[PDB]
Amino acid sequence: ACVHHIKRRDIVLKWELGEGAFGKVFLAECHNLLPEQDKMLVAVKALKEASESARQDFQREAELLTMLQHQHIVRFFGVCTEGRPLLMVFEYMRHGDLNRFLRSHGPDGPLGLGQLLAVASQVAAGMVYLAGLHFVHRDLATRNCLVGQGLVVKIGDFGYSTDYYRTMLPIRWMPPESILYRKFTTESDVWSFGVVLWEIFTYGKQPWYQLSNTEAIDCITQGRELERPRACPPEVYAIMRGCWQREPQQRHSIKDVHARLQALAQAPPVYLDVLG
């Protein structure tokens, strides 16, 4: 609602974490933000376009990120509108995006079953929060999740061009009805969560990596399912299949998916990937 305003001089730019057509993302030090933390690290999203439509869309977005407050939703600290670029201040997630983290902690040390379940459960938690507010993410993927201190996994949205097919759609994460009709609901977000589970248990591999964007559309629209990852116990694959029901009305709700994952996270199945 009422967006926090950070003074430009309170932001000290330390390095560039990445960029896009939108502008740049920086690692920065931020003064007078949190109590007892005189200086703290943050990630700063800087917008290239400073036009009236760009300023209005920014305020809309900043107000929305201000409402979204949860343990597994990336923290929004405020804005800086002291000229171009317009700056959005978020918490710094030291391990970067979940996809990169998964791959870099894959068997290619490696994350064990319990760690994978914790990751999965944390993403499910953030989604229960979003589903509660009737908020549709539309782009749930491990590349839009972030990992901070203590393997704390939170959901974000960066806005990985190989993951989208031309409007640029993340088809491999999309259920049949979103590919065909461009309709995004909590039920399609559930489908995406199931693909996010597959990604977790493949250590960030691309769903349908053997196939091209146009071949993957055929797979999904013909009801062809992603195979059970070798590191995935059958109990979790059961959860993925429930997320992938062809009919949106027949997919499990995220609250249920979370409950089953939270249960598995506390008492993990005795499963060794090496045996299958």
Ligand X SMILES: CC(C)(O)COc1ccc(C(N)=O)c(O[C@H]2CCN(C(=O)Cc3ccc(OC(F)(F)F)cc3)C[C@H]2F)c1
Ligand Y SMILES: O=c1[nH]cnc2scc(-c3ccccc3)c12
Binding residues for ligand Y, rule: CB under 6 A, are 13-16, 26
Residue 29 assigned as binding residue? no
What gap in Å lies between CA 181 and CA 189, rounded to an integer? 15
* Structural tokens at position 8: 């430009």
189: annotated active-site residue:
no
Cα torsion angle, 151, 229, 241, 141, sign: positive
From the list ligand Y, ligand X, none, pick the one residue 146 interacts with, judged by a Cβ distance below 5 to 8 Å according to partner type.
Answer: ligand X
From the list ligand Y, ligand X, none, pick the one residue 13 interacts with, judged by a Cβ distance below 5 to 8 Å according to partner type.
Answer: ligand Y
Strand partners, 209: none
* Structural tokens at position 164: 């989208």
Report strand pairing: 23-34 vs 11-20.
Answer: antiparallel
Among 11, 30, 33, 73, binds ligand X (CB under 6 A): 73
* Structural tokens at position 40: 């703290």
Among 155, 195, 216, 232, binds ligand X (CB under 6 A): 155
Helical (H) or strand (E) element with 143: none
Among 43, 46, 111, 141, binds ligand X (CB under 6 A): 43
> Smaller CB distance to ligand Y: residue 26 or 101?
26
* Structural tokens at position 6: 């950070």
Cite the active site residues: 139
* Residue numbering of the annotated binding site for ATP: 17-25, 45
Binding site for ligand X (CB under 6 A): 17-18, 25, 43, 45, 65, 68, 73-74, 90, 92-93, 96-97, 100, 137, 146, 155-158
